[PDB]
């Protein structure tokens, strides 16, 4: 239910990332022998299937405000823990209290 | 911090001259410098600027004096040389070499003028 | 309260926190991802004179940094080497572990002098300056960055479907970060 | 293309006087610091006031300054006989590629 | 079941905090335009309703010992994660094992 | 094993970890809070000569810092500018991101000389020195702090119910941090 | 199901650790009065009961590869959060979705 | 995907993440532990000339640190004070909060000169250098370390069952970290 | 209000002798460092011993010192003929507003 | 580090005198200084202390000599001046100016005495 | 036990010439830097090239260098008349306990 | 940075001599030094190395000259002394004292040679 309201859409997403588990080949995992800082990235290309990309860009926009107000309130110099907090909230929403069946947040079928 | 300028003598208009500013008390390699002259009965005036060698920016000259004058420096001797060519009328004044150098705290940069020399045409 | 966007198969929905839709399955921390997207993709002007108008100096606001795991290839990066007219640094040195943006075709390297009337350089539209897997609100000296924004996603259960040369262009600038700024490109 | 200043000022001993230096959009308007120097007859100017009322060394707290819009002021309270000097305001012009502009000069009298 | 055993009770709690989600007004959220470091706080006043405040102060006292012994054992220079650890322990206590109904820690009614 | 205190409506109970009372509802990380409370509220003497007796110098113990989110208005803060009789610093410079306590009516700014026989200044009763949303065990140079303690709370489900001028007083001190210390207040 | 394949086995494990909750005696918990950095450790001795030690050493070996590839991908200078991530994944595996009884990951007996 | 090893009573099994065996009970974060084990226990040569062959200098790879809570008594530690032949430091100074390994009977303190052809010293077999509750991939100056590896364990429910003098030996070295290195022990 | 010291000491070449300096609660008792200076006849005193046996430069390891309670000692092992000098102990008094107090003087003889 | 003191001459009791300590080798702006005098046949003695200007602490004087003497410094010349007024009996001794200055490592502060001058009354 | 170099080299003005310095396993082979010095007749040698083409001060970009295996080269492009000098390559031997080894000397001619 | 060597005179073979290298411009306490000699008509040559006192490493000597020569330094005077005993044949050459000292940036260490002296036997 997200509609892009930006002047344009770049419909292609040419991305780079790191592989948390690459299929390493022999001794390449050893820091002494492995690749330099510049050679640890993999790349890929995504198209506008399912109209997803125009959605994704817009999502980023809408996030920014909240994120800024969050960082103003923290005293950490570098914040690494946002995803852990999101996961903990996700778990708490469902299992933090007593589960009454037929309730809107209890997904147990007896 | 101390600066001394030399080269001050009478020159027939049309000749050339070299004014030398030699300083001590700071790391002379990483400081910008400006040549400024003061005419009698008038306020201060600006003639040229030389940037640090490491930055590599081109030296700049004022509007009337751009051309004839030539600024340079030498680090191995800790000196700043200004060369004036084909001196004309009303080029008659004291010359000062001004630098901005910190106090080792880097929070600010004071200005340190020099005594300067006299240069008269006739 | 930061919008967490859940991606269903062939669809993207902004997860509503008051409601609870358990039909999404998040079985491991591997499914949680953060992504950095470049403002370029929204059609903003990338020319150096236009780009430089979005940044401005400000005192009294401490800088902040947040990490991100995956990004987009940038066409344009910027690299600032700015000094005050007396000769001083108005951009802070890069802290430990902040490297330049990994992949950009063109690096617009701008050097010159300006008033630098403020302790840090911020983005006037509230976007971030993206570095190598760290997004910060301020510009650091001599470190190539891209303008961008950060999003958070829950990836689908299937791993597989989801997740070189460069050139330098040099510029000279005077009156950097002012209403009228004078550029000479070499 | 020069900074303006009043020809001369006067005041009784012990009172306060202010010297004005009025710039343009390129110099003070853009956001550059103003430097005040005092030249006693026969010698070279030295620094008096830098930026926001910062004193290099051995300067009586009688000297202060302000900046607003395109103008600036130097305030000296408690004029004594030795204050006879020429005061010059300086800043950095832009239409000059960020380079010195000097004020005319003011005769302060006690 | 907490009884204050301090020499005094300040029954009033005049507090300050940060708003993680303030109802921002237009462009105030932007770091460049927002308030300075000093202007991000909100304030409030709590009275001794329910005898809660004399309790709260005493609670802080009793915590201190344990907290100190914790910080001695960690090597972190700045500890930001105590609340996350508390939340994880809370979740583990209830759902970390097999839930046998009528058990003292399983709050599911079938 | 740190006492987590749960606040029921109109009551406060120290949550017993061996027992499990699920009737408390913690549905989000927003309900977890840490609070800093000032020792002043327990009736301890706040006079500068009395206050200075609670601090003492010690070597061999590394300092530690823990954050806290909400605090109490302080009447009295302290600010130390201490040097050794030869002329040296016995209080370490403030690390990055440690600012003074935000709200206190009176700042007792103490300067002088002392033996400073130790690497860091600790609190003899085990309390903390509270700064701007960071509590540390040691005193930093030139940074106003309050003496205090830290508590952790589970707030109630309802958000709404739960969660300027200053003056400086200067002192001179000799023999600071000794059995007999000599003060002159100006 | 772990078999040691190292050249040797040191069957004894002489370990040191810190006590997160030592039975402190009076004022020893106070940082000012407590022990120095060197005196906070306790010690113990484990034998090769249950053939556990030869297992444990081998386990460490097998971990190293994965750990290195993890640290390459992170930008943190000091990583303190691995155990928290492990706990969150443990909770998510069991309770992150709808529990269908007789499923292989739902341990609820109705 | 890091092997988490679960210890059953009188047994140790490497927990299989695809399968789910709930019969293990993890009721608190107190049961999760990390342990550092010394390579010595696997029979590797500990002599200084043999040990020094496992380390090598490398540029371009940023160092990384991970903490660990419990360790093993070491027989042999090493301590390097190495300089380049002109006179310079090829080993970086210890960052804040990295102290030496707590318990080792013998400290082989090696000083001398070498080419030091690289920014950091790494372990050629991929092991870690263990310090006081911090394991790092690189060698720091003047700080005693042991070679070791890190494991992660789920302890059993029962707490109770699970969880001094030193000597210095000095050496002089030339051509340190080279194919042929010359030692003189005093 | 002066530091005490023995009038003179003697000892055979090559052996050890100790010079005592006994203070009061205000000086050494409070916790201040003790400075030892050697004045050869005809010239000015220079520093010999600072704090906990710290040597500035070019000082034979024959000189050491200790401090205990309100007293301190200087130990010199291996007296040679050139050791003829006056040794003075110094500290900082408090009843003097943290300012120099000097010892009387000791004639060491070889 | 080097210090030189001057002003040493015979003065009729009741006059005045200025002893000047000029030094070089360290940043003279941020160091404390003490004037100490040694009488013949007696041990060392302390007369005065001047604090750094930046700190602003008041200079202090010994018990017998508080009053008549006056200590000051000048940074633009790197000097420490002690002025003695109405010299009386037994004020006869060598004068030394002592400072404590680090070694750029800041772990400690060595003491650096000066040669000193003679001052006799008659 | 000396570094080798060609007796003399020649080349036309404006062109490029290279001077070779060939070492052994102990010196350049081990991994030590190579220093190039230019001695004009009658004066003392000064540094020309250090490590990986690093210039101390006031050196024309005409001078460059490389290292490979046990050999190294100095490349000078644009020979002018003032280039008459003796060039010496230096490194650190190991069989000498990490100490100077000097090259023979090369007569470059223009 | 500047160095000056002295002691250069003719000596009958079999005597002894002292060559003194006095320098200024850097912290002389923490720098290594090498004595190197150049014979006429031949390339450069190395004679000795002295390590920093703080490190405490033993000074080393070349292969032919090990023994007769003796190197040392003195920090309180900022000097490096080389003593030559029982001078024989072909010990005839210029002597230079070389040090490696950083530029305050510590990224590298330049080499700074000295003018050197002449020593001839006959
Ligand atoms: C999110 O998108 C909006 C609009 O697409 C961006 O906003 C604009 O805001 C600036 C000033 O704040 C205006 O000059 C523009 O005209 C606005 N755009 C439009 C289309 O009116 C906003 O900048 C984006 N978010 C970020 C972080 O850049
Ligand atoms: C918690 O409260 C207690 C008592 O209310 C405080 O303790 C006292 O301890 C000091 C020395 O440790 C004694 O001098 C006092 O006499 C004690 N108080 C009483 C009433 O006997 C303790 O300091 C408080 N906690 C903290 C962190 O300050
Ligand atoms: C884990 O154990 C293996 C074998 O027990 C260690 O590996 C060896 O690898 C090195 C080079 O990588 C070889 O020289 C050895 O011969 C290998 N051992 C055997 C028995 O063949 C490995 O080093 C251990 N892990 C760590 C981190 O040290």
Distance of alpha carbon L68 from the chain centroid? 14
The DSSP symbol for E62 reads H
- The closest of H135, H150, H63 to G77, measured between CA atoms, is H63
Check if the beta carbon of residue C37 is closer than 8 Å to that of residue A91: no
Q: Which of A4, A61, A69 to mutate to test the pocket of ligand 1 (most atoms within 8 A of CB)?
A: A61
**Cβ-contact E97, E103 below 8 angstroms:** no
Breaks (C-N over 2.5 A) in chain C follow: 163
Nearest to C85 by CA among C170, C176, C171: C176
Measured between beta carbons, the chain A residues lying within 8 angstroms of F134 are 75
Handedness of CA G49, G51, G56, G61 (dihedral sign): positive
Distance CA F159, CA J66 (A): 67
Measured between alpha carbons, how far is H33 from H16 in angstroms, rounded to an integer?
A: 18
**Is the Cβ–Cβ distance between L47 and K102 less than 8 Å?**
no
Distance of alpha carbon C86 from alpha carbon C185, whole angstroms: 23
Nearest by Cα to B21 from B32, B42, B35, B38: B35
Tell me whether residue K101 is exposed, middle or buried, using C-beta atoms within 10 angstroms of its C-beta: 0 to 12, 13 to 18, 19 or more: buried
Measured CA to CA in angstroms, residue G66 lies from C107, F141, G55, G71 at distances of: 36, 44, 18, 9
| Whole-angstrom distance, CA of residue H21 vs CA of residue B41 | 97
Residue located nearest, by CA, to atom 12 of ligand 1: C125
Q: Specify the residue for token string 């005409």.
A: K62
Is residue L45 within 8 angstroms of chain K, CB to CB? yes
Radius of gyration of chain L (CA): 14
- The beta-carbon neighbor of C126 closest among E20, E30, E36 is E30
Return the closest-CA partner of residue F82 out of I101, I99, J55, J30.
J55
Helix E82-95 crosses helix G82-95 at what angle (to 10 degrees)? 30
Number of H helices, E strands in chain B: 0, 10
Dihedral-angle region of residue J14 (phi above 0 means left; psi in -120 to 50 means alpha; beta otherwise): left
Q: Looking at the 3D structure of chain H, how many domains does it have?
A: 1
Residue nearest ligand 2's atom 9 by CA? F125
Helix (H, G, I), strand (E, B) or coil at C2: coil
Asked whether E76 and F11 are in contact (CB, 8 A), the reply is no
Element (H, E) at B9: none
Helix H or strand E encompassing D71: strand D71-77
- DSSP for C116-139 reads --SSEEEETTS-EEE-SSEEESSP
Burial, F110: exposed, middle or buried (Cβ in 10 Å; 0-12, 13-18, 19+)? buried
Cβ distance G12 to F37 under 8 Å? no
Ligand 3 pocket, mutate which of G5, G9, G10, G61 (most atoms under 8 A from CB): G61
Q: Pick the closest to residue B66 from B50, B82, B47, B52 (CA basis).
A: B47
Which residue intervals of chain C are DSSP H helices? 48-52
**Please, are residues F82 and F114 in contact by the beta-carbon 8 Å criterion?**
yes
Closest CA to H169 of H114, H123, H105: H105
* Ligand number nearest to the C-alpha of A7: 1
What contacts J28, CB < 8 A, 6 or more positions away?
J75, J78
Tell me which residue of F57, F15, F55, F10 sits closest to F156, measured CA to CA. Answer: F10
Tell me whether residues H85 and K31 touch, CB distance under 8 A.
no
Give the DSSP per-residue string, C139-154: PPTT--BEEEEEEEEE
What percentage of chain E's residues is helix, strand, coil (to nearest 5)? 40, 15, 50
Cβ–ligand 3 contact at H135 (below 6 Å): no
Q: Are E55 and E46 in contact (CB under 8 A)?
A: no
Residue with tokens 């050496």: H171
Distance between CA G105 and CA H20 in Å, rounded? 6
Strand order in the sheet with D16-22: D16-22, D71-77, D63-68
Residue ranges in A11-107 assigned as alpha helix (H): 52-73, 82-95
Helix, strand, coil abundance in chain C, percent, nearest 5: 5, 40, 50
Where on the phi/psi map is residue H142: left (φ > 0), alpha (ψ -120 to 50), or beta? left
Phi-psi region of H9 (alpha: psi -120 to 50; beta: other; left: phi over 0): beta
Question: G39 is written with which tokens?
Answer: 């005196």
Enclosing domain of residue I106:
1-110
The number of distinct structural domains making up chain K is: 1
- Cβ F130 under 6 angstroms from ligand 2: no
Find the DSSP H helices in chain L.
none
Residue A37 has a CB neighbour count (10 Å cut-off) of 13
Subunits with 3+ Cβ pairs within 8 Å of I are F, J, L
DSSP code, position F95: P
- H178 vs K contacts (CB less than 8 Å): 30-31, 94
Tell me how far apart the alpha carbons of residues C100 and C129 are, in angstroms, rounded to a whole number.
11
**Which residues, other chains included, contact F118 with Cβ-Cβ below 8 Å and sequence gap of 6+?**
F56, F57, F58, F59, F90
Among residues C133, C130, E23, C34, the alpha carbon closest in space to that of A65 is found at: E23
Specify whether the backbone of L25 is left (phi greater than 0), alpha (psi in -120 to 50) or beta.
Answer: left
Written as six digits, the tokens of B4 are: 């001394």
**Residue G48, CB half-sphere, CA atoms under 13 Å: how many?**
9
CB distance H69 to ligand 3 below 6 Å: no
- Beta carbons of D54 and B108 less than 8 angstroms apart: yes
3-state secondary structure of F67: strand
Q: Residue D12, SS3?
A: coil
What angle, rounded to 10 degrees, do the helices at A82-95 and E82-95 form? 30
Residue I100: count other Cβ atoms within 10 Å of its Cβ: 21
- Bridge-partner residues for H146, per DSSP? H130
Task: Dig out the tokens for K48 from the structure.
Answer: 């020309």
- Separation of CA F125 and ligand 2 centre (Å): 7
Give CA–CA dist B33/B47, Å, rounded: 11
Please report the atom of ligand 3 found closest to the CA of residue G65.
27
Structure tokens at C170: 């040099």
Contact assignment for G31 to F60 by CB distance below 8 Å = no
Please count the CA atoms within 13 angstroms of the CA of H66 that sit on its side-chain side.
23
Query: Which two structure tokens, joined as six digits, stand for I33?
Result: 């460092």
Of E77, E92, E98, the CB nearest to H22: E98
**Number of neighbours of residue A105 by Cβ within 10 angstroms:** 16
Resolution of the experimental model, in Å, one decimal: 3.5
Note whether C77 and C146 are within 8 A (CB). Answer: yes
Nearest to residue L53, comparing CAs of L35, L76, L70? Answer: L76
Tokens 């041990």, residue?
Answer: J43
Identify the DSSP state of K46. Answer: E
**Cα–Cα distance for residue pair G32/F63, rounded to 1 Å:** 11
Number of Cβ within a 10 Å radius of residue L7: 18
8 Å CB contact of C86 and B52: no
- Please give the residue range of the domain that contains residue H137: 1-186
C121 forms bridges with which residues in the sheet? C57
Phi/psi region, residue K104 (left: phi>0; alpha: psi -120 to 50; beta: rest), is: alpha
d(C-alpha F78, C-alpha F40), whole Å: 13
Phi, psi for residue A95 in degrees, rounded to 5: -115, 10
Report whether residue H182 contacts ligand 3, using a CB cutoff of 6 Å: no
Report helix, strand or coil for A25.
coil
Task: Please choose, from the candidates K97, K84, K105, K78, the residue with its C-alpha nearest in 3D space to the C-alpha of residue K2.
Answer: K105
> Please, do chains A and F touch (3+ CB pairs < 8 Å)?
yes
Ligand 3 touching residue H126 (CB < 6 A): yes
| DSSP string across chain H | ---PEEEETTEEEE--SSS--TTS---SGGGEEEEEEEGGGGT---SHHHHHTTEEEESS----EEE-SBEE-EEEEEEEEEE-TTS-B-SPPPPTT----S-EEEEEEEEEE----SSEEEETTS-EEE-SSEEESSPPTT--BEEEEEEEEE--S-TTT-----EEEEEEEESTTSSS-EEEE-
Interface of B with C (CB under 8 A): 31-32, 51-52, 55, 57, 100, 109
- What was the structure determination method? cryo-EM
CB burial of residue H97 (10 Å; 0-12, 13-18, 19+) = middle
Q: How many whole angstroms from its chain centre is CA H52?
A: 14
Instruction: For chain K, say whether H125 makes contact (Cβ under 8 Å).
Output: no
End-to-end CA distance of chain J: 35
| Whole-number Cα distances in Å, C1 to A61, A70, C6 | 15, 9, 15
C-alpha distances out from residue H28 to C156, E57, E92, Å: 30, 28, 6
Tokens of D28: 């003070």
| Residue K62, phi then psi, degrees to nearest 5 | -70, -15
- Please name the residue that has the structure tokens 């120290």: F14
The CA-atom distances, in angstroms, between F157 and each of D20, D110, F9, F161 are 62, 73, 9, 10
- Please give the distance of CA C105 from its chain centroid, rounded to a whole number: 16
């Amino acid at each position: 239910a997200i509609v892009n309201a930006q002047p344009k859409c770049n419909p292609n997403l040419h991305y780079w990332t790191t592989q948390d588990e690459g299929a390493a080949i022999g001794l390449a995992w050893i820091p002494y022998f492995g690749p330099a800082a510049e050679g640890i990235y993999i790349e890929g290309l995504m198209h506008n299937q399912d109209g997803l990309i125009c959605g994704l860009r817009q999502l980023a926009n809408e996030t920014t405000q909240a994120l800024q107000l969050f960082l103003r309130a923290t005293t950490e110099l570098r914040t690494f823990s946002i995803l852990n907090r999101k996961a903990i909230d996700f778990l708490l929403q469902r299992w933090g209290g007593t589960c009454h069946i037929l309730g809107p947040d209890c997904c147990i079928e007896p | 911090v101390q600066l001394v300028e030399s080269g001050g003598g009478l020159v027939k208009p049309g000749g050339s001259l070299r004014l030398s500013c030699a300083a001590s008390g700071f790391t002379f390699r990483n400081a910008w410098m400006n040549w400024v002259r003061q005419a009698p009965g008038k306020g201060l005036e600006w003639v040229g600027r030389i940037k640090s060698r490491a930055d590599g920016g081109p030296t700049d000259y004022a509007a009337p004096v751009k051309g004839r004058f030539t600024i340079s420096r030498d680090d191995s001797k800790n000196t700043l040389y200004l060369q004036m060519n084909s001196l004309k009328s009303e080029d008659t004044a004291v010359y000062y070499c001004t630098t901005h150098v910190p106090d080792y705290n880097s929070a600010y940069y004071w200005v340190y003028w020099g005594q300067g020399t006299l240069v008269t045409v006739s | 309260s930061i919008p967490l966007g859940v991606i269903h198969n062939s669809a993207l929905q902004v997860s509503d926190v008051d409601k609870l839709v358990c039909r999404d399955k998040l079985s491991s921390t591997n499914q949680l991802r953060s992504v950095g997207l470049n403002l370029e993709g929204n059609g903003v002007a990338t020319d150096v004179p236009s780009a430089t108008k979005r940044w401005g100096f400000r005192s009294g606001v401490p800088p902040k940094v947040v990490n991100y795991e995956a990004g987009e290839w940038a066409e344009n990066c910027y690299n600032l080497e700015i000094k005050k007219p007396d000769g001083s640094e108005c951009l802070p040195a890069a802290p430990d572990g902040i490297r330049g943006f990994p992949r950009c075709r063109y690096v617009h390297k701008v050097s010159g002098t300006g008033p630098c009337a403020g302790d840090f350089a911020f983005h006037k539209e509230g976007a971030f300056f993206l570095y190598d897997r760290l997004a910060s609100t301020v510009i650091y000296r001599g470190t190539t960055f891209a303008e961008g924004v950060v999003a958070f996603l829950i990836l689908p259960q299937a791993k597989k479907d989801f997740f070189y040369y460069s050139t330098t262009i040099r510029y000279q600038a005077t009156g950097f970060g002012t209403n009228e700024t004078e550029y000479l490109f070499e | 293309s020069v900074l303006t200043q009043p020809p001369s000022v006067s005041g009784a001993p012990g009172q306060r006087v202010t010297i004005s230096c009025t710039g343009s959009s390129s110099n003070i308007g853009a956001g550059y610091d103003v430097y005040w120097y005092q030249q006693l007859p026969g010698t070279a100017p030295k620094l008096i006031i830098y930026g926001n009322n910062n004193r290099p060394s051995g300067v009586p707290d009688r000297f202060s300054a302000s900046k607003s819009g395109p103008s600036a002021s130097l305030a000296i309270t408690g004029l004594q006989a030795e204050d006879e000097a020429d005061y010059y305001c300086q800043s950095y012009d832009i239409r000059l590629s960020d380079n010195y502009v000097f004020g005319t000069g003011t005769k302060v009298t006690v």
